[PDB]
Design an enzyme around this catalytic site. Structure first.
Site, mmCIF file in Angstrom:
data_model
loop_
_atom_site.group_PDB
_atom_site.id
_atom_site.type_symbol
_atom_site.label_atom_id
_atom_site.label_comp_id
_atom_site.label_asym_id
_atom_site.label_seq_id
_atom_site.Cartn_x
_atom_site.Cartn_y
_atom_site.Cartn_z
ATOM 1 C CB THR A 130 -0.969 -0.052 1.179
ATOM 2 O OG1 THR A 130 -1.733 -1.250 0.997
ATOM 3 C CG2 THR A 130 -1.950 1.117 1.230
ATOM 4 C CB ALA B 19 -5.681 -7.578 3.068
HETATM 5 C C1 LIG Z 1 0.280 -2.655 0.535
HETATM 6 C C2 LIG Z 1 0.099 -3.662 -0.656
HETATM 7 C C3 LIG Z 1 1.352 -3.196 1.486
HETATM 8 O O1 LIG Z 1 1.522 -4.593 1.221
HETATM 9 C C4 LIG Z 1 -1.092 -2.477 1.398
HETATM 10 O O2 LIG Z 1 -0.782 -2.329 2.783
HETATM 11 C C5 LIG Z 1 -2.161 -3.587 1.282
HETATM 12 C C6 LIG Z 1 -3.478 -2.999 1.778
HETATM 13 C C7 LIG Z 1 -4.632 -3.751 1.440
HETATM 14 C C8 LIG Z 1 -5.848 -3.252 1.919
HETATM 15 C C9 LIG Z 1 -7.056 -3.889 1.663
HETATM 16 C C10 LIG Z 1 -7.068 -5.056 0.910
HETATM 17 C C11 LIG Z 1 -5.871 -5.568 0.417
HETATM 18 C C12 LIG Z 1 -4.661 -4.925 0.676
HETATM 19 N N1 LIG Z 1 -1.804 -4.710 2.159
HETATM 20 C C13 LIG Z 1 -1.575 -5.949 1.707
HETATM 21 O O3 LIG Z 1 -1.616 -6.276 0.524
HETATM 22 C C14 LIG Z 1 -1.233 -6.973 2.785
HETATM 23 C C15 LIG Z 1 0.221 -6.818 3.137
HETATM 24 C C16 LIG Z 1 0.431 -7.424 4.385
HETATM 25 C C17 LIG Z 1 0.568 -8.808 4.489
HETATM 26 C C18 LIG Z 1 0.785 -9.404 5.727
HETATM 27 C C19 LIG Z 1 0.873 -8.624 6.879
HETATM 28 O O4 LIG Z 1 1.098 -9.229 8.090
HETATM 29 C C20 LIG Z 1 0.153 -8.891 9.123
HETATM 30 C C21 LIG Z 1 0.748 -7.238 6.775
HETATM 31 C C22 LIG Z 1 0.527 -6.647 5.538
HETATM 32 N N2 LIG Z 1 -1.460 -8.307 2.221
HETATM 33 C C23 LIG Z 1 -2.244 -9.216 2.816
HETATM 34 O O5 LIG Z 1 -2.843 -9.041 3.877
HETATM 35 C C24 LIG Z 1 -2.345 -10.537 2.061
HETATM 36 C C25 LIG Z 1 -3.359 -10.406 0.922
HETATM 37 N N3 LIG Z 1 -2.771 -11.596 2.975
HETATM 38 C C26 LIG Z 1 -1.889 -12.274 3.722
HETATM 39 O O6 LIG Z 1 -0.675 -12.075 3.715
HETATM 40 C C27 LIG Z 1 -2.517 -13.358 4.607
HETATM 41 N N4 LIG Z 1 -1.799 -13.398 5.874
HETATM 42 C C28 LIG Z 1 -2.067 -12.164 6.646
HETATM 43 C C29 LIG Z 1 -1.435 -12.205 7.990
HETATM 44 O O7 LIG Z 1 -1.989 -13.369 8.640
HETATM 45 C C30 LIG Z 1 -1.719 -14.617 7.969
HETATM 46 C C31 LIG Z 1 -2.275 -14.607 6.593
#
Ligand SMILES: *[C@@](C)(CO)[C@](*)(O)[C@H](Cc1ccccc1)NC(=O)[C@H](Cc1ccc(OC)cc1)NC(=O)[C@H](C)NC(=O)CN1CCOCC1
Ligand SMILES: *[C@@](C)(CO)[C@](*)(O)[C@H](Cc1ccccc1)NC(=O)[C@H](Cc1ccc(OC)cc1)NC(=O)[C@H](C)NC(=O)CN1CCOCC1
Ligand SMILES: *[C@@](C)(CO)[C@](*)(O)[C@H](Cc1ccccc1)NC(=O)[C@H](Cc1ccc(OC)cc1)NC(=O)[C@H](C)NC(=O)CN1CCOCC1
Ligand SMILES: *[C@@](C)(CO)[C@](*)(O)[C@H](Cc1ccccc1)NC(=O)[C@H](Cc1ccc(OC)cc1)NC(=O)[C@H](C)NC(=O)CN1CCOCC1
Ligand SMILES: [Mg+2]
Ligand SMILES: [Mg+2]
Ligand SMILES: [Mg+2]
Lengths: 222, 212, 204, 233, 195, 222, 196, 195, 196
Positions: free
Chosen positions: B1, B49
């Site tokens: 993000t 997310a």
């Molecule tokens: C940018 C891309 C930074 O990566 C943004 O913060 C983005 C925001 C966002 C908002 C709404 C919907 C989608 C995306 N965040 C992500 O893409 C996020 C990055 C992230 C991953 C893991 C984290 O650890 C807590 C923190 C940030 N991506 C995700 O959440 C992905 C899609 N899902 C996972 O990694 C699933 N994980 C999450 C943590 O728990 C275990 C499973």
């Protein structure tokens, strides 16, 4: 020390049409370098024209599907046999997944069906409940192989109109059920060639207003 | 993000990217990072997310219950503090949330509140949040003035996300624009970086680092 | 601290009817920070083409090393090195650094000047040769490239058609990888002419 | 969080035309020590189901008691306990599967791999697997531990898919199982010669065979082998 | 050692380098010059691990000056940057590598063109219109993406540089005590005293 | 990998699958694991791919020089000795697990070598990830006094067991027969039971689909 | 491994099982753990297969070179060479070796060399993982100056028990008889020894 | 959160607190007020772990304001500081302690005396003529040891405070974006707008 | 510890050494490892002294309360109570217990309970650190329906070897005879058993 998670492999795939939607998944189940089953279905009819699959760790996957199936059942009891819309199902699933935020279900979940306008719908989830509606999604072990192919062939990404100097994009259009099944079969055969955890068999569940139909195809067993 | 929002003469601009990541895997290019809480309240999201999606949707429910109980729309301060108090209870558990609660009320006027998952809550005029916040800050700060027009402010917000979408590997997809006025929020469309970049490069004459 | 995924990048190679194609992206970054959008990963020594992905310092070092070795080869042999022979040279050189390897994923491509046969090959960082009729992939979006190539590819493609297939394989694979993209280059190689095309792709 | 102490090795099984076969050796290992030699690891439930268990024996004995107690509980206020409302293999399996997954979810697993073999009331063959993680799967052939690596390949030559089940007789199926047990005795360091075998047929019912032995073993070629390379004498 | 920037314009290369030298909770010096003149038309700025930085810079300086005397000829910026890269490329697989990142700004007298090279401690060389090492890049690159034009003058380049420093002074956590700016062009190297 | 070696009446036969892996991805679908050390001494390799190739070439090179020095055809025990002493010196860090076989003036031979430098002798052997699947077949069907045709069948069957049941093995079966008094016949792709089925669709793009920024002729000549 | 060497009236007999394990998998069920370092000097190998093999090869080389210069070496000399290798490389080796040989002057002799690299001359010796289970049996049943048939029975019964209880031991029971008469190889199959 | 100072003079207590709020490589805000008015004649500045700081400050504020309403009476600075200390003393042996350090500057209306209390996150209370938390103390204490006099005026105290801020701006590694200064005396609490 | 229990014609006999160690130091050389949980139900304790002691006390309490309500408990019942405690608290216990008792109906019975908490009914049982060295001996020498004098000799010879080889075992050999006649305590000193 005891490790509560495992990787059962396999891969799944959801594509949405104009008046239909498909949810495909291979029938192979594995642990490490062994094959557990050549035919173990993981794409399920959950009622109300919703098909579901939770690919990754099968124990968690089965548990989740089982709970959602039960959620659909109690939705009927508590709300006068009302049909669970695909958007409502998706939000319900988010709460199921996020309920175990601090001890997650190790699965990438995909559901498919028809929205309330009768149009094809695919929703996809991360392990802890994040979700998004799309025309297209691959999930599981071979998702990294299949997904970019779908971007190219379903959403026509990076494809421009010939002779327009890369200025006019290829126009978006819905695909026929015949054309979609072709892409599914080619996606899985390609994934079977290059991913060791994918193979044995392919089972597709097609969802139209008429109901839920099934189709099965052989895949390479090596 | 990468997400931003800034106060100016004509209200508040809010701009976000649309990329989701799972490490170096691009999970999505079409994700919605502005949640519409009510006609006068917006919430940007960055971080985990599911955490973001779940708790900001939850926040909207709490804001709805406020106006039912109190017969009055919740203040931006009170809305942001509901969320900050919530994440503070989960402090240490590993929640990841970078939100910016943007909105207008009669008593407050246009207001922005930064809230994050380790309990920080800050009122301010300019904020950029996410992995590409620094890239957005670079363009936004160097061009920002209070007296910007609605047209110029909308563009600066769009151009700041574009800048970050370009340089930050964990930002991109498309730009979602919003404009918050005394009358409420107004959506200013989805802008795909695939077309927007070249459109901006040609018209503005910028991005000379790239092979044109 | 994983050498293979600090700078980012991809290379792909394909065969066609009496021709070969090799393509790469242009990104060089430091993890999340994109630094350069001009960093080419394909080099050539005579008619033999070499693409290299991985740690950028080693990409540069190995290019300089193989230029060095192929120049001495040509002086002593009094002829240009062939792709089959060059492939062996790459393998030897990589395995020489067995317990302190160059963190790279090289890809050889070219047409044998004597037989006229199209030739492509890939390697792991330690020298293991991966010869292939159809295609070779390498880089941070290798999974993506494998999926694109395995579906899109068909044998005996004409140069003009082969260009479209390899370009679409690279572009769509790169767009699903955070550390790849930022521009792309495609080399179409015929028996005695070589066309180099810069592709227009999304810049995020 | 556990560690298994006294352990049981492979449990192997397969389907044939009229029913299912399951087998497991009679050893209770204590690490490398072959401690207990009279251990029965096949446990019949009623006259239509056999549960084969590998892994920790203390947990196996706990599961024995649960099944024993399940039969008692099913008989309560049930006139059709030995007829229409008798315990099915599918009922017994789902119960165990529920327990196994609940225990792993509490980070206190039953350190086992289980195969429930039986025949349903409508004549259908039942064969399904479940383990300490709560992972479940079904197949024409199922095996645990070393059995998965060595037995399954041999049993799959007989029944490679669903359509091969009607073509496989009880004579052919049993011979494959007995052969697999021999191969496991050759190659599994925590296996024994003595084993038990069970057949659940839809016609002839439950046949439980005890005190079987691996026989017709090839050891004669060993005498010709000398040293590890150049040694001749 | 923290902030080092570089901007190549039409007829010159401009290097900006922070003046602060910090250790622990004390700023030991606020007037530190983080460059060495390698040759009359080639300047190298540096940043990284304490001690390593100056030791490396001076070692390179000595070698280039030795070359200049031996051949009675100035080495091209491209040639100097390649030499520097190779030294860092050797270093990274040594017992104790030089942890130094550098920018090499030079004016090629044969081509009559300014050139800016960015090389990190791994030996990763790139020619750029503008460059930065450390956390600086996370602000300056996007800023320059927007405001930079290839045909700018030196005076325009300095204003563009002032825009970067202002942004860094606003958003950076640490006080880097301003910058020393130096210009490399056809007439050689000179320092901007009032910045 | 899955690799085997089987002794018979008048010689020895070795076989191997043709899958190479990097993680769960199939890197090479048709690689060559049968290695020529000398004309009538061949070597099947499992483990770290480059190590099996490098160690077998090095010893093969030194065996050739030794054969020229002594004016004698090389022996299997020489290759065995040189390989194990080399592998032992590197304390397992060279991850080569080899089945060495061949015919020489002393007779026909079959050995296996492990990465740490330990050697075994046998009439039938198997190494690699699918060695258990292969050894199961060998233990079930091997007998004393096998013929040439029977040994090839048994060897290829043992490789097939690995191909189908082990995820670390797949694609084709390579065989090399080394009979006494005859030339060794290398049967590349002896079986090919994993042919890719016809694709559902041709993805040949219309010319001009890809957007281009620049063109240029590259100079390869002097 | 289960291994042992036993002196008796006419000379000495070495005994061993035939099981090689990689974890719980039996890599070789017909292994030959009795190895010749000289005409009538043999050894039993336990521990790392690679290490004991590399050592035995070096010892064989040393004793062949000894024989070329100074004639037939003593069993003590052979044990000393084993010791020297095991002791000086104790940090990098996992080798438990029993050395047994027949001189005409000294008759049957048995030297055992544990992990440390120490030497111990004994009437009989037992070693390897499975030896733990037969200390009690062997101590109660061993007698000095046994006959050939008695010693063969003693080893057969001992290794039978070691095999029965140790999972890391099994297969056939190989034996090597060292006397003035010469060298005799013996083998005993499961069907025989299991039901003792 | 970083720099919080306190100086007790003849007739008042002066608190200086830094304006910067930083997270990662970004200064998110440069106008942050790190205090809460506990009562009309009692002011508490704070610094420490993000979130904890404000959560604790406001919690204390709520409790003191509740006391004021209940008794229709202002609690003495000594009494407030004892209450605060006890809360932190409880906290340190909790599942998750408040990681907050505070200065409590107050004017006792009964004694007609200014009072300054320094309390760390462990619940360590001390009354001082001048106080500081974090790395600030390593510079300011020695400076105040030299320049402080007990009979100084508020204007003299502000100059003494300016001397501290100047030293910190010179020698501290981080940019703390200046300070907000507040005076506590017989007439209550007021903010110095131009500093 | 070295401990064992052996059934025979007239009933069952329990046997044990008397050594308690804290490291290599012998904390008690005259320990009584044979403990009474009921009139003619006894047990041998191995593993943690504190754990086995705490368990045996709870079992004694349960069987005393059982006797008050339902009369004399079976040996199986006693073993079940031991099992229940050992199994349910397997994470926090280090206890290897052999339960032995004499019913008039069931005669002599022996149940062994290893670390896991599993139950195993056997003709005879051996356990503790020193038992490893006598598996071979005990298997070869045990016979069913032995006499009292034969069983006493069997245990004495077995524990003598276990003591001889195991450093963690030693002192005197205590034994407890359980028959219809009653309960008899026996003791055997080093000067006797060492020279067997
Ligand atoms: C940018 C891309 C930074 O990566 C943004 O913060 C983005 C925001 C966002 C908002 C709404 C919907 C989608 C995306 N965040 C992500 O893409 C996020 C990055 C992230 C991953 C893991 C984290 O650890 C807590 C923190 C940030 N991506 C995700 O959440 C992905 C899609 N899902 C996972 O990694 C699933 N994980 C999450 C943590 O728990 C275990 C499973
Ligand atoms: C089967 C496929 C193992 O799954 C075989 O052993 C096969 C043998 C073989 C021999 C010659 C030619 C091709 C294939 N081995 C592999 O394919 C091997 C699998 C492997 C990966 C990692 C290992 O140790 C860490 C050991 C075995 N694959 C490779 O060697 C590939 C080509 N290279 C890598 O995975 C990268 N190497 C770099 C060197 O360090 C180890 C990882
Ligand atoms: C019994 C099985 C165990 O005590 C014997 O000692 C036996 C001795 C033997 C084997 C073959 C030929 C002659 C004599 N030893 C083994 O079978 C041995 C087990 C072992 C492995 C590792 C050890 O520590 C280094 C000690 C004993 N097996 C092997 O050496 C096999 C061939 N290799 C492996 O298990 C791989 N090892 C290599 C060393 O590092 C650990 C993995
Ligand atoms: C032999 C000595 C060892 O197997 C016996 O099992 C013996 C059994 C016994 C002792 C007294 C009375 C009846 C039965 N056990 C011991 O002597 C025992 C050794 C032992 C210590 C710790 C163990 O794991 C927890 C297992 C066995 N000795 C003791 O318990 C002595 C009294 N205490 C200690 O050594 C102190 N321990 C306490 C537990 O934590 C480690 C330090
Ligand atoms: Mg396979
Ligand atoms: Mg980007
Ligand atoms: Mg003793």
């Amino acid at each position: 020390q005891f490790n509560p998670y495992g990787d059962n492999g396999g891969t799944i795939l959801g594509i949405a049409g104009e008046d239909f939607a498909v949810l495909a998944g291979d029938t192979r189940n594995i642990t490490d370098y062994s094959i557990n089953s050549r035919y173990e279905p993981k794409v399920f009819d959950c009622g109300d024209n919703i098909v579901m699959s939770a690919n990754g760790f099968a124990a968690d996957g089965d548990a989740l599907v089982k709970r959602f199936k039960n959620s659909v059942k109690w939705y009927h009891f508590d709300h006068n046999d009302k049909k669970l819309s695909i958007n409502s199902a998706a939000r319900n699933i988010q709460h199921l997944l996020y309920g175990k935020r601090f001890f997650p279900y190790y699965v990438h979940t995909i559901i498919a069906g028809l929205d309330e306008d009768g149009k094809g719908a695919v929703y996809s989830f991360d392990p802890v409940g994040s979700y998004e509606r799309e025309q297209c999604r691959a999930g599981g072990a071979a998702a990294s192989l299949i997904m970019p192919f779908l971007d190219n062939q379903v959403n026509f990404k990076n494809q421009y109109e010939p002779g327009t100097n890369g200025k006019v994009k290829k126009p978006l259009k819905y695909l026929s059920v015949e054309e979609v099944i072709k892409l599914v079969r080619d996606s899985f055969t390609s994934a079977t060639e290059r991913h060791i955890q994918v193979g044995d068999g392919l089972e597709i569940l097609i969802v139209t207003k008429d109901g839920v139909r099934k189709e099965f195809y052989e895949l390479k067993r090596d | 993000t990468t997400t931003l929002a800034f106060r100016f003469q004509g209200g508040i601009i809010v701009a976000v990217d649309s990329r989701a990541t799972a490490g170096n895997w691009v999970a999505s290019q079409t994700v919605k990072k502005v949640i519409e809480i009510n006609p006068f309240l917006l919430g940007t999201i960055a971080g985990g997310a599911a955490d973001c999606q779940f708790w900001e949707t939850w926040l909207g429910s709490q804001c709805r219950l406020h106006e039912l109980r109190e017969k009055e729309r919740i203040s931006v301060a009170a809305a942001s503090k509901i969320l900050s108090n919530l994440v503070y209870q989960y402090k240490g558990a590993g929640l990841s949330m970078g939100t910016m609660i943007c909105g207008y009320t009669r008593k407050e006027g246009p207001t922005i509140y930064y809230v994050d998952s380790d309990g920080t809550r800050l009122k301010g005029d300019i904020f950029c949040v996410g992995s590409g916040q620094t890239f957005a800050y670079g363009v936004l700060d160097s061009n920002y003035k209070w007296d910007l027009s609605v047209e110029d402010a909308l563009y600066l917000g769009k151009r700041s996300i574009l800048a970050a979408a370009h340089r930050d590997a964990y930002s991109g997809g498309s730009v979602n624009l919003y404009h918050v006025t005394e009358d409420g929020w107004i959506y200013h469309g989805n802008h795909d970086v695939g077309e927007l970049f070249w459109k901006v490069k040609e018209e503005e004459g910028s991005f000379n680092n790239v092979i044109g | 601290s994983d050498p293979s995924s600090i700078n980012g990048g991809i290379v792909v190679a394909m065969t066609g009817k009496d021709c070969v194609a090799i393509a790469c992206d242009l990104r060089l970054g430091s993890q999340s920070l994109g630094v350069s959008n001009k960093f080419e990963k394909i080099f050539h020594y005579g008619h033999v083409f070499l693409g290299i992905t991985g740690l950028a310092t080693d990409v540069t070092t190995l290019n300089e090393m193989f230029r060095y070795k192929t120049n001495l080869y040509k002086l002593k042999e009094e002829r240009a090195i062939e792709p089959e022979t060059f492939t062996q040279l790459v393998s030897s050189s990589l395995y020489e650094r067995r317990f302190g390897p160059y963190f790279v994923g090289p890809v050889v491509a070219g047409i044998n000047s004597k037989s006229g046969k199209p030739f492509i090959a890939g390697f792991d960082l330690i020298g293991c040769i991966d010869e292939a009729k159809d295609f070779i992939v390498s880089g941070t979006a290798s999974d993506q490239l494998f999926g694109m190539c395995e579906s899109l590819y068909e044998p005996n493609l004409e140069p003009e058609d082969l260009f479209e297939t390899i370009s679409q394989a690279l572009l769509n694979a790169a767009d699903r990888d955070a550390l790849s993209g930022w521009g792309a280059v495609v080399y179409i190689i015929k028996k005695d002419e070589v066309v180099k095309r810069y592709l227009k792709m999304r810049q995020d | 969080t556990q560690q298994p102490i006294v352990t049981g090795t492979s449990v192997i099984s397969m389907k044939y035309d009229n029913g299912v076969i399951i087998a497991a050796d009679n050893l209770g290992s204590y690490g490398s020590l072959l401690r207990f030699n009279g251990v029965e690891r096949l446990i019949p439930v009623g006259d239509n189901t056999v549960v084969g268990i590998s892994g920790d024996i203390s947990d196996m004995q706990h599961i024995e008691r649960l099944l024993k107690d399940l039969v008692t509980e099913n008989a309560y206020d049930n006139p059709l306990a030995d007829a229409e409302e008798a315990l099915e293999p599918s009922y017994i399996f789902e119960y165990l599967a529920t327990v196994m997954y609940q225990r792993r979810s509490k980070m206190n697993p039953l350190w086992n791999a289980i195969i429930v073999a039986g025949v349903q009331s409508n004549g259908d063959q039942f064969l399904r697997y479940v383990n300490l993680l709560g992972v479940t799967y079904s197949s024409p052939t199922l095996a645990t531990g070393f059995g998965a690596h060595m037995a399954n390949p041999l049993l799959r030559k007989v029944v490679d898919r669903e359509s091969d089940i009607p073509k496989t007789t009880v004579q052919v199926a049993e011979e494959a199982i007995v052969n697999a047990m021999r191969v496991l005795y050759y190659r599994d360091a925590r296996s024994s010669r003595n084993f038990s075998l069970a057949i659940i047929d839809k016609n002839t019912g439950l046949t439980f065979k005890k005190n079987l032995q691996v026989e017709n073993m090839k050891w004669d070629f060993a005498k010709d082998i000398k040293g590890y390379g150049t040694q001749k004498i | 050692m923290d902030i080092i920037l570089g901007i190549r314009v039409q007829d010159s290369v401009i290097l900006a380098s922070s003046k602060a030298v910090t250790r622990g909770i004390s700023v030991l010096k606020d007037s530190d010059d983080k460059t060495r003149q390698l040759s009359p038309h080639t300047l190298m700025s540096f940043a990284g691990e304490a001690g390593d930085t100056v030791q490396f810079a001076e070692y390179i300086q000595a070698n280039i000056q030795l070359y200049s005397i031996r051949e009675d000829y100035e080495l091209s910026p491209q040639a100097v940057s390649s030499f520097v890269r190779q030294e860092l490329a050797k270093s990274i697989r040594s017992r104790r590598p030089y942890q130094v990142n550098v920018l090499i700004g030079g004016y090629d007298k044969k081509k009559n063109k300014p050139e800016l090279y960015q090389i990190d401690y791994l030996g990763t060389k790139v020619e750029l219109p503008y460059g930065a090492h450390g956390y600086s890049g996370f602000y300056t690159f996007s800023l320059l993406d927007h405001h930079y034009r290839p045909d700018m003058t030196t005076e325009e380049g300095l204003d563009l540089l002032k825009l970067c420093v202002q942004e860094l002074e606003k958003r950076m956590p640490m006080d880097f005590k301003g910058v020393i700016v130096k210009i490399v062009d056809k007439d050689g190297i000179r320092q901007v005293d009032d910045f | 990998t899955t690799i085997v070696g089987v002794k018979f009446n008048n010689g020895v036969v070795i076989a191997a699958d043709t899958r190479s892996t990097q993680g769960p991805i199939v890197a090479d679908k048709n690689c060559a694991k049968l290695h020529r050390i000398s004309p009538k001494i061949w070597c099947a390799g499992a483990g770290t791919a480059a190590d099996t190739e490098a160690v077998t070439q090095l010893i093969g090179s030194n065996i050739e020089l030794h054969s020229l020095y002594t004016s004698r055809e090389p022996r299997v025990v020489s290759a065995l000795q040189m390989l194990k002493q080399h592998l032992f010196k590197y304390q397992g860090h060279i991850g080569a697990y080899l089945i060495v076989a061949g015919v020489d003036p002393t007779g026909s031979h079959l050995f296996s070598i492990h990465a740490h430098g330990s050697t075994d002798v046998g009439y039938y052997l198997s190494l690699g990830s699918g060695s258990l699947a292969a050894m199961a077949v060998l233990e079930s069907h091997w007998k004393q006094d096998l013929t040439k045709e029977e040994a090839i069948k048994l060897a290829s069957d043992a490789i097939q067991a690995g191909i189908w049941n082990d995820l670390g093995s797949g694609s084709n079966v390579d065989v090399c027969v080394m009979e006494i008094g005859k030339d060794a016949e290398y049967l590349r792709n002896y079986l090919t039971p994993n042919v890719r089925e016809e694709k559902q669709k041709s993805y040949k793009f219309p010319r001009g689909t890809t957007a281009v920024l620049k063109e240029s002729i590259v100079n390869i000549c002097d | 491994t289960s291994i042992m060497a036993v002196t008796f009236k006419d000379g000495v007999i070495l005994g061993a099982d035939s099981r090689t394990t990689t974890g719980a998998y039996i890599a070789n069920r017909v292994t030959d753990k009795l190895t010749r370092v000289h005409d009538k000097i043999w050894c039993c190998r336990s521990g790392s297969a690679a290490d004991t093999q590399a050592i035995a090869d070096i010892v064989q080389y040393h004793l062949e070179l000894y024989t070329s210069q100074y004639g037939t070496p003593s069993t003590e000399t052979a044990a000393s060479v084993f010791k020297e290798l095991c002791y000086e490389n104790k940090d990098n080796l996992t080798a438990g070796i029993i050395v047994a040989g027949y001189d005409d002057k000294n008759k049957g002799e048995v030297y055992t060399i544990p992990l440390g690299g120490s030497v111990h001359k004994l009437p009989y010796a037992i070693a390897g993982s499975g030896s733990t289970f037969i200390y009690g049996y062997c101590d109660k049943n061993f007698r000095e100056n046994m006959s050939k048939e008695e010693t063969v029975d003693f080893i057969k019964h001992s290794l039978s028990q070691a095999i029965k209880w140790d999972g890391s031991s099994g297969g056939v029971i190989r034996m090597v008889v060292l006397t003035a008469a010469g060298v005799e190889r013996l083998i005993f199959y499961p069907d025989e020894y299991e039901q003792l």
